[PDB]
Design a protein around this ligand. Structure first.
Ligand SMILES: CCC1=C(C)/C(=C/C2=NC(=C\c3[nH]c(/C=C4\NC(=O)[C@H](C)[C@H]4CC)c(C)c3CCC(=O)O)/C(CCC(=O)O)=C2C)NC1=O
Ligand SMILES: CCC1=C(C)/C(=C/C2=NC(=C\c3[nH]c(/C=C4\NC(=O)[C@H](C)[C@H]4CC)c(C)c3CCC(=O)O)/C(CCC(=O)O)=C2C)NC1=O
Ligand SMILES: CCC1=C(C)/C(=C/C2=NC(=C\c3[nH]c(/C=C4\NC(=O)[C@H](C)[C@H]4CC)c(C)c3CCC(=O)O)/C(CCC(=O)O)=C2C)NC1=O
Ligand SMILES: CCC1=C(C)/C(=C/C2=NC(=C\c3[nH]c(/C=C4\NC(=O)[C@H](C)[C@H]4CC)c(C)c3CCC(=O)O)/C(CCC(=O)O)=C2C)NC1=O
Ligand SMILES: CCC1=C(C)/C(=C/C2=NC(=C\c3[nH]c(/C=C4\NC(=O)[C@H](C)[C@H]4CC)c(C)c3CCC(=O)O)/C(CCC(=O)O)=C2C)NC1=O
Ligand SMILES: CCC1=C(C)/C(=C/C2=NC(=C\c3[nH]c(/C=C4\NC(=O)[C@H](C)[C@H]4CC)c(C)c3CCC(=O)O)/C(CCC(=O)O)=C2C)NC1=O
Ligand SMILES: CCC1=C(C)/C(=C/C2=NC(=C\c3[nH]c(/C=C4\NC(=O)[C@H](C)[C@H]4CC)c(C)c3CCC(=O)O)/C(CCC(=O)O)=C2C)NC1=O
Ligand SMILES: CCC1=C(C)/C(=C/C2=NC(=C\c3[nH]c(/C=C4\NC(=O)[C@H](C)[C@H]4CC)c(C)c3CCC(=O)O)/C(CCC(=O)O)=C2C)NC1=O
Ligand SMILES: CCC1=C(C)/C(=C/C2=NC(=C\c3[nH]c(/C=C4\NC(=O)[C@H](C)[C@H]4CC)c(C)c3CCC(=O)O)/C(CCC(=O)O)=C2C)NC1=O
Ligand SMILES: CCC1=C(C)/C(=C/C2=NC(=C\c3[nH]c(/C=C4\NC(=O)[C@H](C)[C@H]4CC)c(C)c3CCC(=O)O)/C(CCC(=O)O)=C2C)NC1=O
Ligand SMILES: CCC1=C(C)/C(=C/C2=NC(=C\c3[nH]c(/C=C4\NC(=O)[C@H](C)[C@H]4CC)c(C)c3CCC(=O)O)/C(CCC(=O)O)=C2C)NC1=O
Ligand SMILES: CCC1=C(C)/C(=C/C2=NC(=C\c3[nH]c(/C=C4\NC(=O)[C@H](C)[C@H]4CC)c(C)c3CCC(=O)O)/C(CCC(=O)O)=C2C)NC1=O
Ligand SMILES: CCC1=C(C)/C(=C/C2=NC(=C\c3[nH]c(/C=C4\NC(=O)[C@H](C)[C@H]4CC)c(C)c3CCC(=O)O)/C(CCC(=O)O)=C2C)NC1=O
Ligand SMILES: CCC1=C(C)/C(=C/C2=NC(=C\c3[nH]c(/C=C4\NC(=O)[C@H](C)[C@H]4CC)c(C)c3CCC(=O)O)/C(CCC(=O)O)=C2C)NC1=O
Lengths: 284, 51, 162, 172, 39, 172, 162, 172, 172
């Protein structure tokens, strides 16, 4: 990633080494081991001194325990259950879990079937045991290698719908995954089953345009008509937020416009008059 | 149709059936649809040739 | 992109702690190195067209093979020889970038990051460039200390090639 | 993942009735045409790296802004990523050739592929230039007969030109 | 500004006026009368 | 639309307290510098068409693929659209020069501008080559001391070079 | 938000034409006007607590009604009198904002944009504020030209109230 | 727009058979309960402006950041927009009370309502605080007996507490 | 991560030509000014905890709703999170002081920072009150001369006041 890393908030993760638990521990690494585990598994939510899992930390320091068996214990611990499982849906958990340990977003519907039946018959305490005792963990993450961010790199068996939904997961480096305006509901559960992939929107400060998230009844992703255009060069553009005159004039902000070609330039001025900011212009 | 054709016209032939289907889908805005009605020849042979 | 200043940043950011005295001395060191290096930077840009056309001919002298046999890989045609000054013209750019950056940062991303995968495809033999740079290693004409540090980034790109 | 055998199942399952003898006779082409499928994919993947590197000199022939400084395919990591994606379409094409139906290519190659070019900055429509500059080399390698006995594989070949045409149209 | 993106048009503020469709439409033989003289 | 006068308002409104006499003295530069703003925009728009046509020979000097057949700036309508967009940046630049803060240029010129070059196919990074090939002619025009009594108008030239540098960086 | 500079922009942008001489003279006038105006800005912020507590008592003197009857609307309780210095404290802010902006811009959006709809709901009678400002109109103590322009934005908010 | 009479139609139409006498007897509650529907909406809309302004002092009681400077409900136009939206839920609630089924409220009040709070910046979850601070005043006004003869108001009333609970949950 | 040395590279790389001797002489200020950079960050981080706790009594001086019951900085975990974020800006500020260009602070401190205050409920604009209540203590500690030999340290103090001004403006 060059010149998309500074916009999408991915330049800290692009050139970031892995922790690499050298098998004979010194003290200089193991606290930096534990910090980098708590940043990805808890998703940048900060640890308190009381909620440090002090007993668990000692075991991690000891040689017998692996990184692989330590990240089971923090996820089994009620700290991880306090921020996440306490205020989440079942499908909210599976997209969060697959973010927290494998480091991506679920690409197909078949893995959400196959985890909900195992959640009910066996429990959640063995449901976290299915993610850690998986082949996609063991191929890239060793027993001494910590988990890290695997959605950007090609990751040999990937989908291109999965690359769109990882920017849907976290809003950059600052985000703390309960730090998200869409709160208690789940995001990917709608776009998993209807199998359309939404627009990658960057995190903000670099990106001006952020307000748009995928609406409940959006216009089609491709249009079939000619869109009343002399020339068949349709464009589809998405807006963040419209502060026009009130309730009758703009009943709904962040809506999308399927617009033919000879009047694209006259409408981009019309969106900037209303206050709306363009998110994504795809062709159709 | 009523604003554009004044009720009597709706007929069968005058209505572009395709545009109505698109409007329900939401592919084309209503403002885009009246443009497609006014830039129709069922409007053009009706209003423009006589006026 | 790597820099001894930005190595003092990212090592301080993953620890989650402030800029202590043990990262400020890392940037202190770079400034001393940087003053010497810019003298190597002025030594190369003044000899831009001299070094490129000198080293491009230095490839053809040791390798008479690439000037004769027809093919899209070699430089029998003029468009090969036009793309000859493309590559070695681009090689001396990033060497001059790596001296002003003070690190191997821009040389890492711009040149040697995917270099082992292109040369397996386009039949660009890496022994061509590795002895192109050896002519630049000998004929830059620099002296003093800056002649050593300009010699450092040259044979860093050599070990990435071979 | 789907097939020409299992789309017929799922077409019949959504009706929910036994398959007719009219239906199976049309499917009996495929067990005869499986002789013809199985080597046209073997022809492509044998010359897979020759197609990619020759068509790497075709998009870069016509549009020299890509190795221009400041271009999007400019630097070595970016150019290695171009070749990383120049044959990531060919495996998903040759999966659809063996399967016979494009539901593998449509959920793994093209599902949301257009979205990233609006995200990264890499030009979407330029990939659609070079992808159908592969199919004239892909059909042209698969069509010629050397060694294998002559046969009417033209109908199957149209399928192959359709899958590149589908994948190029859904990018740009 | 007035009709917005997604409203059908309508006569605005027709409180003391005639509806437009009724008031305004789209529109704007000596041998016959001698032929009826023949009949 | 914002200003240097109204960003100070909105900075103080989000604090929600009266403006200090330390704050207004720094703003009293602008009523003195409004003598210097008001003619540097008048210098640019007087020579607006000379800047555009001279910098039309600079992007087309260095990158001759644009009038090459098959190029993206190739045909007459496309080339007339280049000049249609070669000075659509200059009005939005000179709006930000008069306003003094770039919130006009950032919601009308650069807001989603990068998105269309990934949509159309026109190279985004090539526009960033020619836009800062305007500013050496734009600052150059502003710099000459002929006519008006010598004054230190150089201080806001670093503002003028900043606005072209902002607009070029957010395209490519 | 309105400003005589940004009126020269938006009138130039809807026409789709450059900044001619007929918009630069619009920003010329504001600059001359601004110097006189700032002097009214320093005259009000120095008298912040003097004008607010002077005008808040000036409401209660002419209106003894709002200090006596119980209700959430009036200021019989201290929380009403605490919200008394909220409103008139917020009134003098935007008047000082409108002088430094040079226009009625921030006074348009921040104060009088939805003011006719709140007062119909919360029973805030607009005759309370319209005579609160009349005390600020008389007791600001400004002189010269800045006393006129500070008097201009005061009775612009009056006509929006009544 | 739907009803309790027309959802029964559309439930029977998707089956496509005549309505049973078991079905119509359950619907015969509604013609008896239409005596009870028709005044509980009349009780709400009679005291509609009293509910809104009293619950405007309840969200603003608990969360005083909203009239804090820099808040999102801060300025006069913003605060007039709060009251513009404080009773835009009550008409859509009282539409669903008269209709008896929430398909009017779900395509006009809540359809994509959550999306704008992620677009504008106004806090979504704060509206869900004040909306169920209306229902304790809405139920509390609709339940108390004054004048009207005693009746089983509560069974219908649970419905009224369900519609506020649906509308508050689908905002935050 | 970027630098003043590597932004000059990337500015020259997107042009794609050797650096001029006019360019390097302007960069030769920085190797002279690296004597002046390297202790102004050392001045800040030496008194880092004194700045934070003194400015914790400045936002909490002016806005006493934060330790009011029901406030957003109210409880002990919330107040410990305030101090957790009161110096998470100072390390990202002092990173940008040492680097000399704010591309470290803009992808790690401010990239999407405003988005969480619209998500959590914590007031965004109140943090912008207290952050530029740090810089009068930050500049005031970095400017005074005791012991250290006199030098023109004023030149990059305007840089240091710019980085706090950038970080405060992009929060509220
Ligand atoms: C006489 C008073 C006294 C005590 C108690 C003491 C404890 C002590 N415990 C240590 C380590 C340790 N102690 C534990 C203890 C435990 N791990 C768990 O999960 C359990 C909760 C718990 C056992 C019941 C572990 C795992 C370590 C080593 C951790 C590591 O090195 O990574 C060390 C580190 C070096 C060394 O042991 O030589 C000391 C000095 N020292 C003293 O002078
Ligand atoms: C804890 C809260 C919670 C719920 C309730 C939940 C439901 C849920 N129901 C599902 C499917 C389903 N649910 C049903 C349910 C029904 N079919 C009928 O006709 C009946 C009316 C009804 C059973 C009473 C069916 C048929 C499917 C699968 C449909 C399909 O895949 O085609 C799926 C799809 C994938 C998967 O199950 O793993 C989820 C996630 N998820 C959650 O997190
Ligand atoms: C016009 C000719 C042309 C092409 C095709 C092109 C591709 C191209 N693909 C890229 C990345 C990428 N491309 C993919 C593609 C895929 N991932 C998968 O698993 C799938 C198999 C596949 C989608 C179908 C991914 C994931 C990346 C980014 C990988 C990363 O950054 O870690 C990049 C890196 C930087 C950037 O995009 O701006 C370029 C330049 N450039 C060109 O000039
Ligand atoms: C029936 C479905 C429906 C709803 C609900 C709806 C709401 C709605 N509220 C809006 C604005 C707004 N809504 C609010 C509301 C609030 N801000 C606060 O701080 C308060 C806590 C809160 C009120 C309690 C505000 C402040 C705005 C103005 C935002 C702006 O001007 O940027 C807007 C656009 C701006 C406008 O025209 O005023 C819409 C569409 N529109 C619809 O069609
Ligand atoms: C198995 C036999 C069968 C067919 C074919 C069928 C079609 C069918 N097409 C529909 C809508 C539609 N169909 C179209 C189709 C088109 N629009 C265009 O401009 C193009 C010419 C064309 C696509 C090639 C559109 C736009 C709609 C929705 C129109 C609207 O709702 O406004 C609907 C409405 C509700 C629904 O789809 O669920 C049905 C039932 N139903 C059947 O049982
Ligand atoms: C999975 C491993 C496998 C392969 C690869 C395979 C291929 C294969 N292709 C065959 C025939 C053939 N294959 C072709 C293919 C073509 N001829 C053309 O001129 C066209 C350009 C091209 C199609 C595009 C033809 C024409 C025949 C003639 C015999 C037949 O109809 O099968 C046959 C018939 C039996 C034989 O050749 O001994 C085999 C074995 N069989 C296998 O078991
Ligand atoms: C595909 C259809 C097509 C045509 C024909 C076309 C012409 C065209 N000729 C141009 C310039 C030019 N045109 C001419 C041609 C002439 N000037 C003279 O002195 C002679 C009288 C005359 C030739 C007989 C010259 C010399 C220039 C360069 C002028 C300049 O650079 O200012 C330019 C502007 C700069 C450019 O890109 O080179 C265009 C767009 N463009 C098109 O897209
Ligand atoms: C006010 C802010 C604003 C801008 C800037 C804007 C640009 C804009 N540029 C367009 C096309 C274009 N713009 C260019 C520009 C260029 N080609 C090159 O090679 C050069 C690098 C560059 C000229 C310097 C070209 C070639 C097209 C048309 C491409 C095509 O249609 O194939 C279009 C397509 C339709 C139309 O123009 O009406 C828009 C809307 N719209 C806006 O609202
Ligand atoms: C070459 C670099 C350079 C510039 C740019 C420059 C401009 C410049 N314009 C000035 C004055 C001025 N400039 C203007 C210009 C105008 N006022 C209007 O309202 C009109 C719309 C507009 C003319 C169209 C005016 C009115 C003055 C007043 C002072 C004077 O007469 O010089 C002065 C007087 C000294 C000062 O301001 O410090 C300077 C410096 N001086 C320089 O050395
Ligand atoms: C930034 C510009 C700005 C102003 C000025 C403003 C005023 C304002 N004052 C209000 C209430 C109030 N206003 C007052 C003020 C008064 N009532 C009296 O009895 C006195 C006569 C008078 C003061 C001199 C009081 C006491 C309340 C509370 C009334 C209630 O709660 O019903 C309210 C409604 C509730 C609120 O959030 O506190 C607004 C919106 N809002 C704004 O955004
Ligand atoms: C506090 C809880 C409570 C409620 C809500 C309540 C309402 C209520 N309204 C009733 C009657 C009624 N309510 C209405 C009301 C109207 N009809 C119309 O067509 C008008 C539009 C509308 C008045 C605007 C009418 C007409 C009746 C007929 C019976 C009667 O006179 O009471 C009755 C008579 C007894 C019964 O229905 O079982 C009840 C119970 N009783 C309670 O205990
Ligand atoms: C809801 C549970 C809860 C408690 C109890 C709590 C206490 C608390 N007390 C504080 C300060 C303080 N605490 C005290 C109290 C004391 N200091 C003394 O000298 C006395 C010995 C002692 C009282 C008996 C004082 C005087 C301060 C202000 C100190 C300062 O500003 O530095 C602070 C930091 C600043 C603040 O917001 O005011 C917290 C967070 N916070 C909580 O969220
Ligand atoms: C170094 C880069 C970085 C930053 C900047 C960062 C900030 C940051 N502040 C957060 C929370 C928070 N931030 C604050 C800050 C404040 N609230 C107030 O009212 C005060 C005015 C102010 C302190 C002065 C608070 C109170 C929370 C917790 C909110 C809550 O728990 O509801 C969160 C959400 C996660 C969590 O709280 O555990 C993040 C990510 N995280 C990072 O990794
Ligand atoms: C109050 C405003 C102010 C500042 C900030 C200031 C700093 C300052 N530091 C200086 C020198 C210096 N400062 C340092 C500091 C260090 N070098 C390292 O490698 C260490 C890591 C680090 C100490 C931890 C050094 C080594 C010098 C060399 C010159 C000298 O001894 O003063 C000088 C000498 C004169 C000059 O540079 O022009 C100045 C001005 N002077 C001022 O008036």
């Amino acid at each position: 990633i060059t010149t998309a890393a500074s916009r999408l908030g991915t330049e800290p993760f692009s050139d970031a080494p892995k922790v690499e638990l050298r098998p004979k521990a010194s003290r200089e690494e193991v606290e930096s081991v534990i910090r980098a585990v708590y940043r990805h598994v808890l998703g940048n939510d900060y640890i308190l001194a009381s909620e440090r899992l002090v007993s668990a930390e000692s075991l991690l320091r000891d040689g017998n325990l692996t990184v692989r068996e330590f990240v089971r214990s923090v996820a089994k611990s009620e700290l991880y259950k306090k921020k996440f499982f306490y205020n989440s849906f079942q499908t909210r958990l599976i997209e969060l879990n697959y973010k927290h340990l494998l480091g991506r977003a679920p690409y197909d519907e078949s893995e959400v079937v196959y985890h909900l039946d195992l959640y009910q018959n066996k429990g959640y305490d063995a449901e976290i045991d299915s993610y850690i005792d998986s082949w996609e963990y063991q191929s890239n993450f060793g027993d001494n290698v910590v988990p890290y961010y695997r959605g950007f790199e090609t990751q040999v068996g990937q989908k291109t719908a999965g690359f769109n939904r990882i920017f849907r997961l976290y809003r950059g480096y600052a985000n703390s995954d309960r730090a998200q305006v869409e709160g208690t509901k789940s995001r990917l559960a709608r776009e998993l089953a209807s199998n359309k992939a939404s627009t990658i929107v960057g995190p903000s400060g670099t990106n001006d345009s952020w307000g748009f998230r995928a609406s409940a009844d959006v216009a089609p992703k491709k249009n079939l008509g000619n869109a009343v255009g002399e020339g068949d060069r349709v464009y589809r553009l998405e807006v963040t937020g419209i502060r026009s005159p009130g309730y009758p004039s703009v009943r709904r902000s962040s809506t999308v416009f399927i617009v033919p070609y000879e009047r694209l330039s006259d409408k981009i001025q019309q969106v900037h008059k209303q206050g709306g900011k363009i998110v994504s212009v795809t062709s159709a | 149709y009523r604003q554009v054709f004044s009720e009597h016209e709706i007929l069968k032939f005058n209505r572009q059936k395709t545009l109505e289907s698109q409007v329900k889908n939401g592919s084309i805005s209503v403002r885009d649809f009246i443009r497609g009605l006014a830039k129709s020849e069922a409007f053009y042979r009706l209003v423009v040739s006589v006026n | 992109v790597k820099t001894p200043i930005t190595e003092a940043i990212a090592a301080a950011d993953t620890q989650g702690r402030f800029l202590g005295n043990t990262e400020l001395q890392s940037a202190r060191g770079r400034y001393e190195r940087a003053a010497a290096s810019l003298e190597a930077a002025r030594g190369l840009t003044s000899n831009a067209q001299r070094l490129i056309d000198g080293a491009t001919q230095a490839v053809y002298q040791k390798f008479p093979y690439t000037t004769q046999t027809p093919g899209p890989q070699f430089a029998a045609d003029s468009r090969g020889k036009s793309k000859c000054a493309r590559d070695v013209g681009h090689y001396l750019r990033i060497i001059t970038y790596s001296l002003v950056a003070g690190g191997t940062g821009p040389l890492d991303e711009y040149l040697i990051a995917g270099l082992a995968e292109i040369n397996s495809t386009f039949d660009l033999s890496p022994s061509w460039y590795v002895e192109a740079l050896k002519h630049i290693k000998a004929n830059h004409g620099l002296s003093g200390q800056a002649a050593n540090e300009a010699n450092t980034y040259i044979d860093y790109a050599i070990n990435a090639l071979s | 993942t789907l097939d020409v055998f299992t789309k017929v199942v799922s077409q019949a399952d959504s009706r929910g009735e036994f398959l007719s003898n009219e239906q199976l006779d049309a499917l009996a082409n495929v067990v005869k045409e499986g002789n013809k499928r199985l080597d046209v994919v073997n022809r492509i993947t044998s010359n897979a790296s020759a197609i990619v590197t020759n068509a790497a000199r075709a998009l870069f022939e016509e549009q020299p802004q890509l190795i221009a400084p400041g271009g999007n395919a400019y630097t070595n990591r970016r150019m290695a990523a171009c070749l990383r994606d120049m044959e990531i379409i060919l495996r998903y094409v040759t999966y659809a050739i063996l399967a016979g139906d494009a539901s593998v290519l449509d959920d793994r190659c093209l599902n949301g592929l257009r979205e990233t070019y609006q995200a990264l900055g890499t030009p979407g429509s330029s990939v659609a230039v070079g992808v159908q500059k592969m199919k004239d080399a892909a059909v042209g390698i698969a069509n010629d007969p050397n060694g294998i006995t002559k046969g009417d594989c033209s109908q199957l070949i149209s399928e192959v030109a359709s899958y590149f045409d589908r994948a190029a149209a859904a990018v740009g | 500004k007035n009709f917005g993106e997604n409203i059908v048009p309508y006569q605005r503020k027709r409180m003391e006026g005639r509806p437009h469709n009724l008031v305004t439409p789209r529109y704007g033989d000596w041998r016959f009368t001698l032929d009826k003289f023949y009949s």
